[PDB]
Symmetry: D2
Subunit: 237 residues, 4 copies
């Protein structure tokens, strides 16, 4: 009957960058699995759009504004969530060439800032899921490889730090996924990229979201420090 190792009934989930594509698909997948979902965006229109998308899909929750680069915004948002809905025990971080260093540095510093803030709730509860979403393939190769290596190593370290508390930390590393950014790449670049994917097609956003939905379940309780590649067989290093 129940597919109970898959229920997120009774959990509150925070998904950053939820207004489109992968973030949005994740927010819906978690809602469908029975979570209350808070999706975030950096603008008020993104927040409002998120709330509408959740509504249209029968997902209870909210859309709110959050800037992951700001301690103040982070602390305030978490307070607001606490007051109105409870503590988020599932957090999905989806909010991301002499910039190559600064980009990775900035993204890992924001993962850390959001993660550390949410850990206190998860520690009290003795339960938690942190899931970090890598960037979609789309100079570019250097940045992509660097961000992916930083994310894997970061995810594994943080997993080690918080594991005694029954909190898992994992990542998902997408490949070429069909989104707004990728639909408008020049054809040459899109056809070259397809030619390197053994499945011979782009991934759907829903196919990232499924993986996230699994990692957030009780069935993935012994998986931690892992980076799961979701790339149709195309591995870029």
């Amino acid at each position: 009957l129940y597919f109970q190792s898959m229920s997120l009934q009774g959990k509150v989930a925070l998904v950053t960058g939820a207004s489109r594509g992968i973030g949005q698909a994740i927010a819906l997948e978690l809602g469908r699995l029975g979570a209350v979902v808070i999706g975030t965006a950096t603008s008020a229109s993104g927040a409002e759009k998120i709330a509408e998308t959740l509504k249209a899909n029968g997902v209870e929750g909210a859309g709110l504004v959050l800037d992951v680069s700001s301690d103040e915004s982070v602390a305030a948002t978490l307070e607001h969530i606490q007051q109105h809905l409870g503590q988020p025990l599932i957090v999905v971080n989806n909010a991301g060439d002499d910039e190559w260093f600064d980009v990775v540095n900035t993204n890992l510093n924001s993962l850390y800032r959001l993660s550390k803030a949410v850990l206190r709730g998860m520690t009290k509860a003795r339960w938690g899921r942190i899931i970090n979403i890598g960037s979609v393939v789309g100079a570019g190769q250097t940045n992509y490889a660097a961000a992916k290596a930083g994310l894997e190593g970061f995810t594994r370290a943080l997993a080690r730090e918080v594991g005694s508390r029954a909190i898992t930390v994992n990542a998902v590393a997408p490949g070429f996924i069909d989104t707004d950014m990728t639909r408008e790449l020049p054809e040459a670049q899109r056809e070259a990229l397809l030619g390197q994917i053994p499945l011979g097609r782009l991934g759907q956003a829903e196919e990232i979201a499924k993986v996230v939905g699994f990692l957030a379940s009780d069935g993935a309780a012994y998986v931690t420090g892992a980076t799961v590649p979701v790339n149709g067989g195309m591995y870029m290093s």
Copy 2:
């Protein structure tokens, strides 16, 4: 009236699980049965086969237990034919079947058997334009000798899984692996406890994994939701990484 047009489930899929008579294999066979697959579990002896049939029955899983020796082309071909005749083509296949100088033989044998089984099942999956091959790594099984063997089997399995994934991807067949850590099984239950505390101290979750926790990961990789996951090795080790 016996017709059944499934959507996004394993309902009606036929799944073959090697080494299904105990522990991880058995937990996988039941998980796939619970997800609605018809399950053929295999063992190398007739008593194992019979035990698998009984376990499936007791749990309300439709399917069968059969004898299969993954090191033999004949046994493989025969077993596949029998499954075709009686149940249909298996489109989900799960391959689950003392010093530091045993590593070579062991890994060589296991990879050659993965290849042999995989190649035989690919024809059915190609015709159907759909498939799931899931390879299960071995559990940690001892200091040094054990570490060498484990790391070697794991490195071979990852590289092999990725290469096969590449070869069959164009056919909407995924190939993935699961790399367990320290799982609570027959071997681990009887370890000296003095040692057991040393082991736990290397695992961030501070416990052994359950066989069911490997089975859940396999259940997910077999689903439609995991369609864009291929060539991956998913570690299920509670955060303990040994290479």
Copy 3:
């Protein structure tokens, strides 16, 4: 022969850094070794002298833009541009890695101008020697990825960027470890011993040579066969 090259080695006052400074000097380089205190700088100058190596000991703090820029200027004025640079100087697990990578970047970017002008260079990053496991694995993963990314950025200029990842090496920190910990560690090392500082230095000496000109973005593990992920 590194005859005619100027080599900067950070953290050169003892152990691995010192053995590297001597190995490069033995290969004919002029060597600037650095330390964070004036006594370290002076000790370096004395070690170099006692071994017949031309060069200098200076004070440098790799976490400060000012100290970096100043030191490089001083080297330029007095000796020329360093075209071989060996970086051996170094809640908490995050801040440690973050700080060390921000220092590698800071030093590296500052020395790249000299190397670009010369169309030749060698940057070699030294990892740290073996809770402890987490820190070690994290610093190692960060170093590998960073070394590879930088390699990519500067490769067109015939500059190589590589790292060396030591295992259990006989130094000041490891000499005083409790026996239990030392015997546990040995049991995991296939060569059944600690490495010598000179064994890291030799790897660095090879990476600095013309023979290693096609090696870039690599992390070479020097650990007697003991791998931790």
Copy 4:
């Protein structure tokens, strides 16, 4: 008498597949470092060419016939070397087959089985001596699948063997080349050659000599604490 001040004076080195390109460049590097070098080929003409090349370069040694897929040929060749020159304590495996000789699997399977066979046969001499160097050469860059597979197999194998023989002061390492300038690669059309270079941060092909230098180092006493490693030599081009 004439004693080289190089890293391998007094050592005997066996290099398989020494009759051209990378294997030949290794044989000459090890000879230039003072080793006595036995280079091997599968045919008598290859063996003879190797002997001529070594002579022309002032390298003491020999060219012999060896088939790494045959236990008999292996044992025989090793015995001949012992009798006539001494035990090879440096062994470089460069006699990898390719898809030319289902295939992706058989290639890697065959090559790892030959590495194991040669390695196990030379380990007795190295154990007696309490010293050794085994160095495996990966293949140079469908093609991506084969290349990544051969590389992953070689890396895991090298590390496992390193573990098995380490207590004996024997090191086992590999070298993983990228795009190297060889007979095959010079002739490529411009379009294909410029595309290739654009994927290599150094912006050029490697020379065979540049692989040979890395092997030379790993064979020395200075690399005594390096074992189980795969050293990539690819100008910054990484594929997996």
